Write an enzyme that holds these catalytic residues in place. Structure first.
Site, short mmCIF file in Angstrom:
data_model
loop_
_atom_site.label_atom_id
_atom_site.label_comp_id
_atom_site.label_asym_id
_atom_site.label_seq_id
_atom_site.Cartn_x
_atom_site.Cartn_y
_atom_site.Cartn_z
N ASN B 26 0.88 -1.26 0.00
CA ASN B 26 0.04 0.07 0.19
C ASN B 26 0.92 1.09 0.03
O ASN B 26 0.94 1.87 -0.97
CB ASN B 26 -1.14 -0.01 1.16
CG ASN B 26 -2.19 0.66 0.96
OD1 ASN B 26 -2.36 2.09 1.28
ND2 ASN B 26 -3.06 -0.02 0.37
N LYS B 60 -0.62 9.08 1.09
CA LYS B 60 -2.27 8.78 1.35
C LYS B 60 -2.96 10.10 1.50
O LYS B 60 -2.91 10.78 2.44
CB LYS B 60 -1.91 8.00 2.85
CG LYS B 60 -1.08 6.92 2.81
CD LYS B 60 -1.66 5.89 1.90
CE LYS B 60 -1.45 6.09 0.39
NZ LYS B 60 -1.96 4.93 -0.53
N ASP B 241 -3.00 0.33 4.83
CA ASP B 241 -4.13 -0.24 4.44
C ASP B 241 -4.19 -1.69 5.18
O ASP B 241 -3.24 -2.31 5.22
CB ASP B 241 -4.71 -0.63 3.25
CG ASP B 241 -6.30 -0.42 3.12
OD1 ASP B 241 -6.98 0.55 4.04
OD2 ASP B 241 -6.95 -1.09 2.31
#
Lengths: 275, 275, 275, 275
Positions: B26, B60, B241
Site C-alpha cells: 500500500n 496517502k 491499509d
C-alpha cells in the site's frame, strides 16, 4: 438538543432554525444570465423572508471532455461574484476544486464548498480549513451518512468549525441515486449536530424534475437546516447541468411550499417515537 | 477481436495476453520494508514467468485525519523507487493525486495511476495525459462500467493512448462493495478494448481476506489483462491499509493458482453463448 | 474441511466433489421440445463425464398476467417427466409452489426446488421438508448469503437434511441483479457447509447472454458444488424465459470450459490468504 | 388529475383525499392486547378526525423457525376480529398467505392484504381478486415502483379494481432498506393513479424507531393516500415484530404531526417544477 450554529454574516444557519437557502444556478454562464437569476432569487426570498445565499460554480472540473464548457474560470468568475455583491448585497457560495483556490476564493465569497468527489482529500480540506470561511461539504454519494463525522473532525483539526453538511443522494445500483431520508439525523448525530442541508437538484440525477417539489417537500418535512437548489430560465438549453434545474419562474410557488412545510415542522413539539 | 495493447517496457499489457501483475504494498513505509517486499515479488514472478510491475503509493491523500501517516511524501518516495529500480530493475506503478505531481513522478516511474475518487477531474487527467506515461485508471466505485468509455476518451484528447482500466468494486448499499464480474467486458467494449485489470485487494473492502484467493480466482477466470494486488509480511500491524493485504509468504502459492487459471482460460477457444 | 454430502441416487452432490449439473429448460412447453433438449444434455454430460440432473418447471406461478402461458400444469407435467425418466433414465429437478404440491411431485422427481420468493414461507418448507426428497433452495435476491443458515435449519426441523443452496444473484438497485462471488463461501459457512450451486441463467437478469460463459466461468472458478442452467434451441422465441437461455447447440463447448475450470480449481491445494 | 378512489365502507381511500390510516399491531397476540390497542387507535383517530382501519395479522407465515410464534391462526383470529367489530365498529385489514384463505377472510374483514413476497404469485392474486374485497398490495422490496403497474392489471383481470398500493421500502445492499420518496409518484403513474400508502414501520428495518416520526413525516409530505403503521404498548418484549413498532402512548402526538402535514400538503395548489 443544542444544534450547533454556523453564521454567514447576518444569517445564522442551524437545524432548529428556519431554513436557509443556498440557491442559484449551476455555472456562471454569462454575467447577464447571472444578474437575472440572482435578481429573481433575491426578490422572492426577500419577499418571503427566507434567509438566502447565492450559488453558482465558477469552473466545471469534472465534466466528460477536456473541451466541454467549464465556466468562466476562477479569475473571471470572481469578477461576476463581486458585482452580484455590489449590485444586490448577497452572500455567496461556490465550490473550489484545488487547494490553491481556497483563499483567493474565500477572499471573495462567504461560503466555500467541498465537492463530493474530493470530500476525502486531506490537502484540500486543510487549505479550505485554514481559510476560516464557512464550509459546505457535499456528502459523497459513496459514503454512508454515519461517516460524515470524520470530515467535520478533519476541518476542526485545521482550525475550522463553521461546517455545514449537505446531502446530495446515495448510489443506488448503477447510474442512479436514491435519497435516504433517515440519513439526515445520522449525519446530525455523528457531527456534533452540525447543520444539515439537502441538495435536491443533484439528488435527482439519473443517467429529473417534475419531482423536484416532491423530493424537496420530503426532505424539508424531515426538518433541515437548509435547502440547496439550482434553477434556470430554460432548463433544457443550458450547457452544464441539465434538467433537475428548477424553472426560474416557478421559484416563488416552490419556495412558499418549502417555507410552509419548514415553519409547520420546525414548529412541532418534540416527538420521541422510540419509547 | 483485436485487443488493444499497452506496453510497459519489455512487458506488453493486453486482454488476450497472459496477465501482468501490478503487485506490491500500500504505502512506502520504510526503504527497509520495501526492498523486502519488492524482492519477494521479483523472485516469485521471475520464477513463475509472470510479467511484473511493483506498486506502492508515496502519499496517502485521503485518509481519516490530517495527522494520519500518509507515507514518505513525493520527494522521499521517488528516492526509494529509484533504488528499487537500481537494485532489482523493475517497472513501477504509483498513484498521483494532483496535476503538478504527474511529470515529476512520470520521470521516475513506468505507470502513473489515477485514483478512483479523482477519475473525473479534468486537470489531473490532462496533466497525467501529457506526461506520455502508461496510465492505470482506477474505476470509481460510483461509476458504472459502461462509463469508462468517457475517461479513455479524455486521455486520448490529451494525447495519451496508453490507458489501462482497473476495476476495484462497486458501491453496494452503505460501506460495502461488490464486484460485478460482468463489468469487465462492458469496460472492454466501451473502451475500444483497452486492457482491463482487477484490483482484488481494494474490492475486499468493508467497513477482507480469507477471500482474496476466491475473489481473485473468480476475476481471473473471466479472462483479464491483469491483476492488481497488495501484500504485507504482517497484515494487521500495518499502518495504512489494513487487511485485504495478502500475506507475503502466501504470494507464491497464490500466484500459481492465478497463472494456472489464466493459462487455462486464455487457452480456451472462442465461445459465443448468445446464439 | 468436511463438506456435507447430498446424494441424488448415484450422484453425490458436494462442494469438494466435481460439480453436478442441474440443467434443462425453463418450462415444459411440449413433450416434443423436451425429449429433444433432455436428449442433448444426456449425450453431452454422458460424453464429458459430468454428473447430471434435468430441470424443467411444470408451472409458471409468477408471471405478469393471469393469462400468460404457465406450462402444462402439475398433472400433465408429471406425465412428461415420467417419460423422460423411462426414455433416458435421468434424475429430475423441478420447482413446487404450494404446500400441497410437494409430495405428489416428490413421488415423481428426484429433487424438489423452493422458489426464491417463497424461501421464507414456513408451510411450504415443512411440506417440502416431510417429503424426504433432496431440496434445492433458490437464494432470495433480497436476502444476504449470511442468512441462508436459517432456511437449512428450518428444513432440518422438518426432518430433512438433504438441502442444496443455489445462488441466483442479488438485487442491485432497481430491476438489476449482481452476483456477489464472495457470497458462496458465506452460504457454505453459515449452513454447516451445505452444497452450494450457482444458477447462472437467472443471475443474468435484467429488465442476458453473451455473458453466460463469462459469469459461469467466474462462479465455477470460485469452487462450487454445482451449476444450474437453462438452454433452448432458439433463445428468442421461447414463451417463458427469454434470453439468458443458453443456445442448445453451444452446450458442449460451454460445458468443456466448466469442467476444465472445475477440475483445475477442485484440484488446487488449500490456500489460506488470511495469514 | 383524477385520482382513482377505493372505498372501504364510509371511508373512501384516495391520493388527493385526506389520508386514511391503516394502523394496528403486528400479530393478534391476545384478545386482551387487541381490544386495548384497537381501543386506543379508535379514540385517537376518532378525536382527530382521521379515517381509520385496524390492522393485525392472524398468522406469521414467514418467520425464522417452524416453531416460532405465528399468531392465533386463521380460525381463532377471525373470532377476535369479529369482536373488535362488535365492540368498536371498525373496518379491518389483515394479510392472507394462501389462495384458500382469501374468501374465508374476506367474509370477515374489509381489506385483504397481499404480502410483499407473494405479490407475484398468480393463484393468490386471482383468489384474492375474485373475493371482491378491497386489496392492499405490499410492494416487494425487490421490485421497482415502475412495475406495480402489472399487479394492478393482474387484479383487474380477476375482476377486482379496488386496489391500494403500499410502499414498504426497497433493498439497499444486504439486510437493509431505503425508502425512495420518488417511488410514490411512479407507482401512482403506472397504476392509473391507484391510491398509494406508505408502511413506515416495515420501511424501518434493519438487521428502527427514533426515526419513525421522521420517515413518516417525509412520506406524508410527499402527499399520500394513506399511512400504514403498527404500535405496541411495549416495543421490546413483543414476540413478533420487534422495534419499529410505535409506542402506543405516542400514537396521538404522532398522528397530530401526520394530519398537520397532510392537511398542509393536500392543501397546496398544483406545482409543476418540470417547466
Amino acid at each position: 438538543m443544542k444544534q450547533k450554529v454556523v453564521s454567514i454574516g447576518d444569517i445564522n444557519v442551524a437545524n432548529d432554525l428556519p431554513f436557509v437557502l443556498f440557491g442559484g444556478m449551476n455555472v456562471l454562464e454569462s454575467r447577464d444570465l447571472a444578474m437575472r437569476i440572482c435578481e429573481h432569487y433575491v426578490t422572492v426570498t426577500q419577499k418571503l423572508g427566507i434567509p438566502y445565499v447565492f450559488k453558482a460554480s465558477f469552473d466545471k472540473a469534472n465534466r466528460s471532455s477536456i473541451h466541454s464548457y467549464r465556466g468562466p474560470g476562477l479569475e473571471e468568475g470572481m469578477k461576476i461574484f463581486q458585482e452580484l455583491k455590489q449590485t444586490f448585497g448577497v452572500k455567496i457560495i461556490t465550490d473550489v476544486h484545488e487547494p490553491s483556490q481556497a483563499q483567493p476564493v474565500a477572499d471573495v465569497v462567504d461560503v466555500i464548498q467541498l465537492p463530493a468527489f474530493l470530500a476525502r482529500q486531506t490537502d484540500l480540506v486543510e487549505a479550505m480549513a485554514k481559510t476560516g470561511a464557512v464550509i459546505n461539504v457535499k456528502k459523497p454519494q459513496f459514503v454512508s451518512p454515519g461517516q460524515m463525522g470524520n470530515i467535520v473532525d478533519k476541518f476542526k483539526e485545521g482550525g475550522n468549525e463553521k461546517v455545514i453538511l449537505c446531502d446530495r443522494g446515495a448510489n443506488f445500483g448503477y447510474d442512479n441515486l436514491v435519497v435516504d431520508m433517515l440519513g439526515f439525523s445520522i449525519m446530525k448525530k455523528v457531527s456534533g449536530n452540525s447543520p444539515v442541508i439537502f441538495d435536491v437538484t443533484h439528488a435527482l440525477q439519473c443517467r429529473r424534475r417534475a419531482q423536484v417539489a416532491e423530493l424537496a417537500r420530503a426532505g424539508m418535512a424531515v426538518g433541515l437546516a437548509g435547502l440547496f437548489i439550482e434553477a434556470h430560465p430554460d432548463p433544457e438549453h443550458a450547457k452544464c447541468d441539465g434538467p433537475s434545474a428548477l424553472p426560474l419562474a416557478k421559484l416563488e410557488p416552490f419556495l412558499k411550499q418549502m417555507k410552509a412545510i419548514d415553519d409547520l415542522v420546525k414548529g412541532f413539539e418534540e416527538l420521541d417515537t422510540s419509547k
